[PDB]
Structure 1
Amino acid sequence: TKEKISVTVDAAVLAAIDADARAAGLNRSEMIEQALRNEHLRVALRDYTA
């Protein structure tokens, strides 16, 4: 199951992600999905302190 959604993003960021898509043989939606899947992991990263 996949959802079609609308989002507003920085145009420069979008161009970069389009290029990363091309390098990987992906279309824009697939590359964005990869980014979202990975960001879900990244937000769980932690910094110990004091």
Structure 2
Amino acid sequence: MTKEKISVTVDAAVLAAIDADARAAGLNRSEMIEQALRNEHLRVALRDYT
């Protein structure tokens, strides 16, 4: 299960909110971002491929 290190630019309020959610969930930032991306991919797949 390999990983890539990437640089991204994100709205400061969006970032602060998901950082607060990461803390509540006991996740670090990269772990909560991965979770968000996995769920968003599923959102898009269910919307566009059903």
TM-score, length basis structure 1: 0.86
Cα separation, partners in 2 of 1:15 and 1:47, compared to 1, 3 Å = same
Tell me the residue number matched to 1:14.
Answer: 15
What is the percent sequence identity of the aligned residues? 100
- Structure 1 gaps of 5+ residues are none
Could you tell me how far 1:27 is from its partner in structure 2? 0.3
> Which runs of structure 1 show a deviation greater than 6 angstroms over 4 or more consecutive aligned residues?
none
The secondary structure found in structure 1 opposite 2:8 is strand
TM-score after normalising by structure 2: 0.86
Give the RMSD, CA atoms, in angstroms: 2.5
CA distance in 1 between partners of 2:38 and 2:24 (Å): 19
1: CA distance between counterparts of 2:30 and 2:39?
14
Structure with higher Rg: it is 1
- Please state how far the C-alpha of 1:7 moved relative to its aligned partner: 0.3
Listed as ranges, the gaps of 5+ residues in structure 2 are none
Of the structure 1 ranges 3-12 and 39-48, higher mean CA displacement relative to structure 2 is found in 39-48
